[PDB]
Every structure is written in C-alpha cells, then in structure tokens.
Design a protein around this ligand. Structure first.
Ligand SMILES: C[C@]12CCC(=O)C[C@@H]1CC[C@@H]1[C@@H]2CC[C@]2(C)[C@@H](O)CC[C@@H]12
Lengths: 268, 58, 338, 228
C-alpha cells in the first residue's frame, strides 16, 4: 500500500513532537518501574496483574528507547538491520502483552468464578515466545526486507508487512469486543441508581493501557490522511505519560502501600 | 432461691478471706525488683548487646 | 437478703480500697530514675518463615528454645524449627477455626482448641506409627480461649463459659471448676511455681486462682476495657495485663495494685499480646497499629519500635533463654528477631 | 548443612508439596456464615456440639456454610474471626407478626459493626406458605402492630405472583421496605444488601446464592481495577 505519511504539509512538528513525547514517556516509565520495583515487599502488590503491568512497561520503555536511538543512525549498515529486527520483535511482544492483559480482564470480569488459578506459566508463554516464533518464521524466508534506503526500518513496498499488521488487527478487534462487553456490563451496573462520568472514566482508564488507540494507523495509511496523522502521533506516543498518570499516581492500592512504606521508613 | 443465698455465703467467705493477706509495705517489693533487675542483668542478651561469636542465629 | 447483700458489698469494698491505698506511698516512677536508660535498640529480623496460609492466633516456644508451633484458619498445625527454618510435622484437625496452642514442658504433648468446644491433645512421640489423636476433652458449653500445660498428666484451660477448668488426662474429668466470673474469660497464664495461676476476663477484672483447693485467692481492680492477653513475671510476684484501652499496666502479686501506666498520646489502638524477657527489664506488647512496640518496664519510656509487619499482630512470645523474640500477624507471616 | 540435615530439608519439601496441593482446595471454596434466631428456617434450609457444617454443590462451584448452636447471647468477642467470609446469610421468620423488631435491631447491629464494614449481607425470607392464610383472614391484622400500614402504596417496580390479592403483595413489600430502610442510611462502601423470596420446600436457593456471590465478586473486582 502507498504510505502517504507526509509529503508537504505535515512533515514538520512531527519529529519534534515525537522527541518530546518519547522523552516524557521514558521519564515517566522509568519512574513507574522504580516505583514498582521498590514497592514489591508489600503483600498488596503480589497478584498477576502487576506482573503484566511491569512487563508491559519494560517492553514499552525498551521499544521507545530503541526507536529514539534508531532515529539517530545511518542507513545501510549492519547495526541498523539488527536493531530493526529487535524493534519489530519488541513491538510484537508489546502487542502480545496487551492482548494477554485483555484476556486476563475478560477472565476477571465475565468469568469471575475462577480468576485465581496461578496461570503464570501460560501468561509468560503467551507474552514472550509468540513474538519469537513470529520472528523466526518471518526470517526463515524474508531477510532482505529488513532495511530501506530512506532509513533502516521494516520496509513497506516489499510486502513483508504481514508480521505486524495482521497481529495488530487481531489484537485491535479482540480489544474492541472486550471493551464493548465490559462497557455494556458497567452501564448495566451503573443503570441501578452521573451517567457520563462513570463510563468516561472507565474508557479513559482502559484506553492507554490495553492498546485501543492503534486503529488510527489503518485510516492514516489509506484514506484522507491530512488531519489524522497529528492525532496518531500525539497519542500513541505519550503512552508512558498516560500509563504513569493513570496507574501510579491515581491508583488506590499503590498510594496506600506508598504511605505505609513511608511510615515504616520514617519509624526507624 | 437457695442458689442466691449460697452465692451470697460464698462471696461473703471469699471477701472475709480477702481481709487478711498480711499486707506489707510496697517499698520492699520495689527494692526486691531493683535487686533482681540489677543482679540479673549480665546474662540477658537483649538489653546488653551480645557479640556475634556467642550468638546461634548468625 | 438482696438489699442487705448490696448494702454489705459497699463498705467492704471501701475498706479493701482503703487498705490498698494505705499500702502505697511511692510508685515505681518515683524510685527508678537514677538507673541509666536502656538506650536505642536497633533489633532487626534475622530470617522470615512465611510458611503459613492465613491469619494466625497462637504461638508457643519450646522448652529447649528450638521448636515452636502455630495455628491458622487452614486447619493445619505445624511444628516449626528456627535454627534451620525447617518443619517436623503437619497436623490436620476437624475444626477449621482454632485459637489456642500449647507445648508441654516435655516435648511430647501438644494441645489445640477453638470454638468447637472440644479440646484435643496430640501425641507427638508416638510408639510405632504416625501422629494421631490421643484424647478429646469436653464438658464446656462455651468456646475455648487458651490453655497452658502444667504437667505431662494434668492441663488447665479457659473457655467461653465465663469459667475456668483444669482437666486430668486420666479419666478426662473436670476435677475442680473455677467459678466467680461474670464476663467471658479470654486470657490465662501460669507461674514458675506449679501452685498459682491468674486469668483475665472481658469485665475489666483479673482473678488469682489456686490449682489445688480451687478457691479464688485475690481480686483485682478495673482495667476500663476487656483484657485480651496476660503474662507472668519469671520472679513470680508480678504480671502485666493488656486491653483495648490502648494501655498496659503491671500488677504485683503482693501489693495487688497497679504501679505502672504505659500510655502514649500517639497510640490509640488496643493491645493484643504481652510478654516478658528473661531478666525482667524489657517487655514487648503487640499493638493493633500494624506493628509491635518495646517498653522499658522499669520506667515509662519507649525504647524502639519493631515495625515491619503488614497486618495486625496476634501472638508474641519470648524464648526461655531470653535471646530471641517471635511475633505473629494476620498476614500469615512469622518474624523472629535476634 | 552437614550430612545430617539432608533428611529434614526433603521432609520440609514434602510438607510444602502437601500444603501446595491443599492450597487449590482451600482457594476454590467460598465460606458463608448463616445467622438467625430460633423459630426461623434453619433445619429446613440445611436439610437439602460446638458448630455445624454442611456442604452443597451448585453449578460445579464449591460452597461452605457455617452456623452455631452453642454460643451465648453475646455475639461479640468471636465475630472478629469472621472477617474473610464472602457474605453473611441472614434468615428471618416473618410469618409471626411478633418478635420482629428484635430481628431488625440485631440486623442493624450486625450491619453497623466497625470491624465488619467490608462483607455484604444476603437477606433471606421463609414461611411464605404461612403468611397467606394469616393475612387473608382478619384476626391479627398488621395495622395494629405497625400503624403506618395505611400510608403504604405498592411500589411501581413489582413482580406479583399470579392469583394474589393486593394485600399480600403489599405485606411482602412492606416487610422488604422495612428491612431495607435501615440499610441505606449507612454503607455506601463495598457492600450491599440483597432481599429475596424463597419458599421452604423449594430448590432455587442455590441458584440465587450463586448469582448473588457472582455479583459480589464482580463488584469487588471492578473496585479492584479502579474502573468502577
Ligand atoms: C515512528 C512513527 C511514529 C509512531 C510509531 O511508533 C511508528 C511510526 C513509523 C513512521 C514514522 C513515525 C514518526 C514520524 C516519521 C519518522 C516520519 O519522519 C516518517 C515516518 C514516520
């Protein structure tokens, strides 16, 4: 498909916004990782969900740092192709991890009876490994399509895009279905009583951690892409900022644990 | 009933027994506590820190 | 009659309180000030055991300062060793809720109880086979609270029938009932001499009880709350009681009057467990404020905080040799300090 | 760790394996506490010396019910241990028009417990087949006991049983409203009440307890995820 990313009136104010968003995301994500690592002795941060959060944050952090390094790198040199392979592997891993989070949410809400079953091995095997299998099947046949004269990324006109867009679409449709079901359940619950507030807060919380903002990419690649690239670049990027501000400074569990840890530290 | 009078007699003889417990000055008890806490202080490895050599939890 | 009894039960109390007051002329705080304070204590846990499943209520040190026991809602009793953080036996039992543990002086018998109203002992050192039930005890229509071994043959216990009872393993019969308490009794401790023991109740009172003749020896003043736990001085002439009034006091046997008041403005949560050290200078109280506190028993001055527990503490004990202290909390964790 | 403690570590490993095996059974079971006074359902509900325990299987879900029959009138000093139950089943006679205010008072006392402001309560009902013949004949009309019967209109939301005069539905919703009036004054946290109507010889109780527990767990999980 024709890229049609930016030709004349959208190139600027795109790389600078990317830099600012990546810097803010990396700072907030390293802060979130430090907070998660420090607050690990408390028993309230012991369930499987916080493990998913930690792995997803680490994957997003490493992907953002790798992309930032990728921007400042010459094309047509072996490290560029190596780091492009790493780039698409890490992005696929992040997508798989958000899919795993969606599956966990579906099991926790719709299927409340059986939430606690110690599925650590299956969750890790679904998160990692699957991107590795996709990478090996892709590199068994497609190897020359890992470098472009423009800059070293995954090529567009070669036709080896299938390794990313198809899993993206699968995760997106699964996320849409799960979000629709959860919103229906929460609206049925909230109907027994401020109507906009609960649903708006729920969708805002669930947006930038489950990966539902990637739908804009399909419309950006094909369609009237003159006012949508701005949103596509100014949203998906600040994932670290959104995840920090919504699941470290506003979560109820982490605040109490932090207060208890501060009290313990000040006691002795 | 008879049970009430029995309880009355029981509490009466208990209270009468409470009237003679050979009450003595409480300063003697304080001095005894002083002596016990002073003499029995060396062999307590809680108030006085003990070296790690003579410690079985090292 | 009733009115005559009520009238007579006033001047006798007045004269008893007058006699108690006349004995006192200077409390402990006026005579223990020239002794140098203990100082800062930086005790930290050496190892964490963390082998349980749910909230715990009871713990007890062994005679040789090596083995200890604990109980939880899982219905499992586990004999536990601190030197090599191992375990010896796991005891399942019928009732899923138990709030009583006891280890005999001789490392043979272990007794457990709860609200099932049945007291069951276990023969650890069986002749030929595994560990099984030895003898059940019944006769109380209220929930058992705690029990403490006196010898390998006899055993005393407390229940929810506002009365205390001692039982003989042979013939399993209640030899001498202990009556004279209105509220429920939820605490009981023994003495180094196997002739006297005391218990506390929820009616803000404690009673001195004699094992042999079964006659209440001494009464005690109020505590403004319900007593949760009690202990006994190794010397055998004093003890400390706790309650939910966020205060602890020390009562000596000879004087029969409180001499120490352990109160701080910051603490408002109640007490749960009280134990003494070997020398008798330090006592530890398990507070409801998610932590434990030490107390210089000779004065009124906090000497450190044993924080580090994420849940409410239930039981706390000190080994016989007085070189370690163990605490238990509702988070199914066992913490021992050097 | 010389060549003496090699057996102890493997014995501890065996104990750990046994405890891990027991963990699944313990975690796959919900515990319920059944309250109530005399002349209530009790034996009839349990039909399908310290404490009694019975178990039932519904929709391949394990359940654990508990009750007492020897505790004294003082309900404190032992309610503290019941701080991890899923819900508290409450049973009310509701057939005899007397001895009803005390039930409401103890229900309020249980609801307003400081240490128990986390568990929900399922309000059960019984003796429906006894209410009908006692209300259709006027000898013990409820108006004398509660003078506020005149000021009562049946709620707009209703599911009346077929072939029932309006007086019996009015009495049923009267009892429901009187029971639920005290509940809404406090709470607004993580627990709600749940009125129900079941006969004595029925078999639908398990379904209602199942769905109520499912709703409670769903609400708790939504609280946990901060979404709600
Ligand atoms: C990295 C971004 C930004 C969003 C994303 O993560 C991938 C996507 C790939 C194409 C990039 C785009 C940022 C802006 C670029 C780099 C334009 O300069 C041309 C290609 C665009």
């Amino acid at each position: 498909v024709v890229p049609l990313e930016l030709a004349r009136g959208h190139q600027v104010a795109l790389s600078s916004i990317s830099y600012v968003g990546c810097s803010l995301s990396v700072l907030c994500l390293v802060a979130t990782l430090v907070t998660f690592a420090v607050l690990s002795s408390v028993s309230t941060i012991r369930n499987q969900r916080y493990h998913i959060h930690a792995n997803l944050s680490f994957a997003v952090l490493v992907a953002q740092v790798l992309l930032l390094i990728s921007f400042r790198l010459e094309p047509g040199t072996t490290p560029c192709q190596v780091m492009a392979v790493l780039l698409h592997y890490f992005f696929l891993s992040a997508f798989a991890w958000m899919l795993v989070e969606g599956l966990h949410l579906y099991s926790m809400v719709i299927k409340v009876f059986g939430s606690e079953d110690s599925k650590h091995r299956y969750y890790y095997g679904m998160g990692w490994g699957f991107p590795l299998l996709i990478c090996i099947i892709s590199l068994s046949f497609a190897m020359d399509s890992y470098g472009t004269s423009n800059n070293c990324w995954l090529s567009l006109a070669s036709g080896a895009i299938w390794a990313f867009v198809a899993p993206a679409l699968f995760v997106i449709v699964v996320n849409i279905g799960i979000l629709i079901a959860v919103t229906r359940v929460i609206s049925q619950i909230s109907a027994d009583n401020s109507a906009f507030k609960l649903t708006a807060k729920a969708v805002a919380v669930l947006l930038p951690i489950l990966g539902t903002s990637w739908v804009f990419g399909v419309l950006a690649v094909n369609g009237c892409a003159v006012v949508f690239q701005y949103m596509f670049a100014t949203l998906n990027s600040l994932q670290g900022l959104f995840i920090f501000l919504f699941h470290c400074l506003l979560n109820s569990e982490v605040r109490a644990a932090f207060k208890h840890k501060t009290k313990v530290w000040s006691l002795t | 009933n008879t049970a009430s009078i029995a309880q009355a007699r029981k509490l009466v003889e208990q209270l009468k027994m409470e009237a003679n417990i050979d009450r003595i000055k409480v300063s003697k008890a304080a001095a005894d506590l002083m002596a016990y806490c002073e003499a029995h202080a060396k062999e307590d490895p809680l108030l006085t820190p003990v070296p790690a050599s003579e410690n079985p939890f090292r | 009659e009733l009115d005559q009894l009520r009238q007579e039960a006033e001047q006798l109390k007045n004269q008893i309180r007058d006699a108690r007051k006349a004995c006192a002329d200077a409390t402990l705080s006026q005579i223990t000030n020239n002794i140098d304070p203990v100082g800062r204590i930086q005790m930290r846990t050496r190892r964490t055991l963390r082998g349980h499943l749910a909230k715990i209520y009871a713990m007890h040190w062994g005679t040789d300062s090596r083995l200890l026991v604990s109980a939880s809602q899982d219905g499992k009793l586990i004999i536990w060793d601190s030197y090599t953080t191992n375990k010896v036996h796991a005891i399942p039992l019928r009732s899923s809720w138990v709030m009583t543990c006891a280890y005999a002086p001789s490392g043979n018998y272990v007794a457990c109880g709860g609200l099932d109203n049945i007291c069951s002992i276990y023969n650890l050192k069986t002749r030929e086979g595994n560990v099984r039930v030895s003898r059940e005890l019944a006769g109380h229509t209220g929930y058992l609270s705690c029990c403490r071994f006196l010898d390998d043959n006899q055993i005393v216990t407390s229940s929810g029938d506002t009365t205390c009872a001692l039982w003989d393993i042979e013939t399993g019969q209640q030899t001498t009932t202990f009556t004279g308490h209105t509220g429920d009794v939820m605490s009981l401790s023994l003495a180094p001499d196997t002739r006297l023991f005391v218990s506390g109740a929820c009616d803000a009172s404690a009673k001195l009880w004699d094992v042999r003749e079964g006659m209440c020896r001494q009464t005690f003043t109020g505590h403004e709350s319900d007593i949760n736990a009690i202990c006994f001085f190794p010397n055998g002439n004093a003890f400390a009681t706790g309650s939910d009034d966020a205060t602890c006091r020390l009562f000596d046997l000879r004087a029969d009057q409180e001499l120490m008041t352990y109160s701080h403005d910051n603490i408002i949560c109640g007490i749960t467990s009280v134990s003494f050290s070997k020398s008798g200078r330090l006592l530890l109280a398990g507070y409801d404020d998610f932590n434990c506190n030490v107390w210089d028993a000779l004065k009124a001055d906090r000497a450190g905080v044993l924080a580090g527990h994420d849940n409410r503490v239930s039981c706390l004990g000190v080994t016989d040799d007085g070189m370690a202290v163990a605490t238990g909390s509702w988070d199914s964790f066992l913490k021992i300090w050097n | 760790l010389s060549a003496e403690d090699k057996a102890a570590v493997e014995r501890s490993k065996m104990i750990e394996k046994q405890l891990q095996k027991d963990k699944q059974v313990y975690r796959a079971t919900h515990r319920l506490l059944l309250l109530g006074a005399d002349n209530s359902g009790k034996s009839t509900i349990v039909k399908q010396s310290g404490i009694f325990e019975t178990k039932f299987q519904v929709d391949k879900v394990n359940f654990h019910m508990f009750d007492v029959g020897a505790q004294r009138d003082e309900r404190r000093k032992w309610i503290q241990c019941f701080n991890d139950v899923t819900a508290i089943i409450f049973v009310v006679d509701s057939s005899d028009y007397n001895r009803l205010q005390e039930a409401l008072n103890d229900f309020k006392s249980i609801w307003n417990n400081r240490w128990l402001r986390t568990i929900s309560v399922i309000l059960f009902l019984n003796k429906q087949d006894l209410l009908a013949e006692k209300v259709l004949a006027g000898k013990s009309k409820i108006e004398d006991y509660f003078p506020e019967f005149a000021r009562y209109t049946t709620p707009e939301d209703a599911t009346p049983e077929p072939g029932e005069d309006p007086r019996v539905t009015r009495a049923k919703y009267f009892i429901r409203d009187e029971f639920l009036r005290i509940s809404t004054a406090s709470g607004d946290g993580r627990h709600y009440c749940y009125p129900h109507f079941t006969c004595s010889v029925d078999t639908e109780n398990a379904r209602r307890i199942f769905n109520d527990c499912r709703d409670i767990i769903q609400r708790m999980h939504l609280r946990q995820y901060e979404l709600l």
